[PDB]
Amino acid sequence: EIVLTQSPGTLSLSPGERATLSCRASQSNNYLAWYQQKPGQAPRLLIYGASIRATGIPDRFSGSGSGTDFTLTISRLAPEDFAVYYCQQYGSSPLTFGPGTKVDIKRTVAAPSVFIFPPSDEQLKSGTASVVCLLNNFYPREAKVQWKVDNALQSGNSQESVTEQDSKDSTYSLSSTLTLSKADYEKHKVYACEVTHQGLSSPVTKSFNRGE
Amino acid sequence: NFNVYKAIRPYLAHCPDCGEGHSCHSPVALERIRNEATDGTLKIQVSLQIGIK
Amino acid sequence: KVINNCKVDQCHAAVTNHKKWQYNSPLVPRNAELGDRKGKVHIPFPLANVTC
Amino acid sequence: EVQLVQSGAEVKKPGSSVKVSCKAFGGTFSSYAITWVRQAPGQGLEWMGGIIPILGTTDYAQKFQGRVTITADKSTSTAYMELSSLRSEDTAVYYCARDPPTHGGDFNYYYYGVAVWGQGTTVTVSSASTKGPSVFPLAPSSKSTSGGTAALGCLVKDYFPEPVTVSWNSGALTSGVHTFPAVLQSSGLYSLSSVVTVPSSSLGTQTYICNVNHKPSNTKVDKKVEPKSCDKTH
Amino acid sequence: PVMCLLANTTFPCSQPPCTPCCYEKEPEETLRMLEDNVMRPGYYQLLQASLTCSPHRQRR
Amino acid sequence: PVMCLLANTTFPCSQPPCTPCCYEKEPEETLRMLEDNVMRPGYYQLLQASLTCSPHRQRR
Amino acid sequence: PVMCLLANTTFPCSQPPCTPCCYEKEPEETLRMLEDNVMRPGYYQLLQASLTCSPHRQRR
Fold this sequence. Notes:
The structure is cut from a larger assembly and holds one copy of chain A, two copies of chain B, one copy of chain D and three copies of chain E.
Chain A: E1 5-6, E2 11-12, E3 18-24, E4 33-37, E5 44-48, E6 61-62, E7 65-66, E8 69-75, E9 83-88, E10 101-104, E11 132-133, E12 143-149, E13 152-154, E14 162-163, E15 173-174, E16 176-177, H1 184-187, E17 191-197, E18 204-208
Parallel strand pairs in A: 2-10
Antiparallel strand pairs in A: 1-3, 3-8, 4-5, 4-9, 6-8, 7-8, 9-10, 11-16, 12-13, 12-17, 14-15, 17-18
Chain D: E1 3-6, E2 10-12, E3 18-20, E4 22-25, E5 37-39, E6 69-72, E7 81-84, E8 92-95, E9 121-125, E10 143-145, E11 153-159, E12 165-168, E13 178-180, E14 190-195, E15 209-213, E16 221-227
Chain E: E1 3-6, E2 9-12, H1 22-25, H2 30-33, H3 43-51
Antiparallel strand pairs in E: 1-2
PDB class: viral protein/immune system
Keywords: CHIKV asymmetric unit with Fab C9, VIRAL PROTEIN-IMMUNE SYSTEM complex
Entry title: Cryo-EM structure of Chikungunya virus asymmetric unit with Fab C9
């Protein structure tokens, strides 16, 4: 039946004041509960709905429902309240979790703080061209990878996967690795990494040379 | 032919009452009861399939 | 597969290649409005006429 | 609140058993219906299509067993879970440390008056062999980064398994340095970043080195850092 | 014999031109085969042949 | 607000006057505590602190 | 009701935009910051947060 749906698909707020997350289904009857996940970490309980409250912690976060809809609020959300939020009602043929509404603490505005770094240097057996592009520090994530290597716009010929958020900063990373063949460490004297981002609508870049 | 049950599979369908008084999507969804036989035997059609694995 | 600039509700998904079929029952949706992609089953237990 | 515990993280290969464990304490000498929820790497909480509440039958949801086979157990304070003949995609964090999940629509019902959560644990169903990062970029090269305004740091690549050991000149650099951790790449291997980002008049004065080890294997490396703002790089 | 069809092809219904037990060879064949006709009396000889005929492990 | 009592003493309800896990230590506690005391608006929280005691086996 | 905005973004009614002090950093900020969303109930906390300027020594 149903499948739970959460009303905010994105939200972003400074330190302080208030939030109001929301979830809906055409029925209730047996309690859904609201759970907060910090990035990289296990959930915890904030609220019960359907008729009556419960909590694990003092009343800075609190919530209620009416008719088909159920809500969670946070007071003075200055702390580590960068998180994704879920709820569930468990029973019979499927009902399942909500999708994950995410809210964040509005960092000071800056351009992509991206990086590039030298590979295995001297030896040329195979694979030793493998420099890496990383996404770092910027928000929100309207973003995609770009490359300026072999003196041209590059895509393909890379080893690709995501990596965790920038801990003492704000946001996500990845390890886009230029797995070029052998001599490609020293064929082309320039490497440059780039971001494509639908909020910036434009590139931002960094570049290096061997010994700098 | 008896082997036509290779080509077709069970399904969930909506059910008015799954026991606790609530409607559900159900694997035993009950489709029609036909009771033409004057000896009072029922032929029941259900969304399971039975006698095959 | 992945799409790069979207909320969970700006998107929708369903399983679609089906090699197994169903009775065309009410109380499940139709595949398309068209003259439907078929197959038929002989059903068991005919009426006999007999003595009680 | 009920106190919750699990078995530590694992590395595994397809086609074998995994014997995960959980313990719940203070009250709950019979489990308060704790349940083996699971989250695949970085996804939204698409959950365990296997086990729902258990302490008398190994009840699952309407999905798993069909792809991969799973069960759970009901010992005093102690809720074992067995997942077996698994595949790479069963790599996830598992959160047994959870509330009563009241099964609306078929049998019986549960409380509100106390919260219960806890930590998760990881099984790493993976193709790689035991290998440190140090033999790739770090041993042959100098470490270098170029930003000139404030973007300065270091990198680490393709170690397996976890965890990293990472350090800098006299340890005190870790108080100004920021570090940006890994997850398992699709190749079965991990990648880690670490940076010293400050404007050049408050950075260019000192001298810097960086030190890395892979404590599953003890492949240690220590190296010269050449940030473009310092005169050691000129 | 009575005859049965698929697009550019028409054949005697007693078995299809496809190799025997053809649904086992192509599980999505029937959603072509019974799309463009079904109503002719040979189609229920055809359905039996489509789902029940000899592999190399069988004989009469 | 308003608060609970016991014999010669008046005290806040949400932790016991006896040492915690007080029902496990001295189970006849109710036979001193609850002669006429059932009228207290704080009794619900005295009960929760007495039985669901958050005992030394638990954590927060 | 649901929260107020800054018209730059759907930022909540009262919070510091990047720093405290507001009017004491540029006095024509009221021109941008206090034109219309004061018709939403939460914006009286923006007058608390902005005009109690909160430089380093103003503390709790």
